[PDB]
């Protein structure tokens, strides 16, 4: 079958913000993931990508903001973000 599936298709981008950097103090990383991926799949993908033991994965769905402009209401895409908790010393480099 065509279309090999890579674990990097699930993990889209890291979330960079004050809360994410504060969570880095707890070995916690916030990633924007594919909105159809469950916690187990995200955990396995993170493990395979980074060679890092993951203790916990917490996910939330975030609604996109709606703003009224010329041409009416626009709606930013919905996102799901996984909050991955890493083992005591493993560390993930997001650059």
């Amino acid at each position: 079958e065509l279309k090999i599936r890579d674990p990097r298709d699930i993990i889209l981008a890291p979330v960079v913000s004050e809360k994410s950097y504060g969570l880095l103090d707890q070995n916690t990383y916030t990633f924007v993931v594919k909105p159809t991926a469950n916690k187990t799949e995200i955990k396995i993908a993170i493990e395979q990508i980074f060679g890092v033991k993951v203790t916990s994965v917490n996910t939330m769905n975030r609604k996109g903001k709606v703003r009224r402009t010329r041409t009416g209401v626009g709606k930013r895409p919905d996102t799901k973000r996984a909050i991955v908790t890493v083992a005591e010393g493993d560390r993930i480099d997001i650059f």
Partner: protein, 69 residues
């Protein structure tokens, strides 16, 4: 370089390795874009185009449009 019809001179397993390497490069590019790096933005689309090309070659081989090496 952006890959071309010389992908038809490769084998199935190394074409699949090319797919995996392209996916990993795209992963790195997306992370750089999120983190504020990646001045070279055109590569972020060209890597996806290359993935499309490799899948095109694989599917033509699988469907026997082009004889498989």
């Amino acid at each position: 370089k952006l890959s071309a019809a010389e992908l038809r001179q490769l084998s199935g397993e190394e074409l699949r390795n090319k797919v995996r390497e392209l996916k990993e490069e795209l992963f790195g590019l997306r992370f750089q874009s999120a983190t504020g790096q990646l001045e070279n933005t055109a590569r972020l689309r060209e890597v996806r185009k290359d993935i499309a090309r490799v899948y095109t070659v694989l599917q033509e081989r699988n469907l026997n449009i082009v004889d498989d090496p």
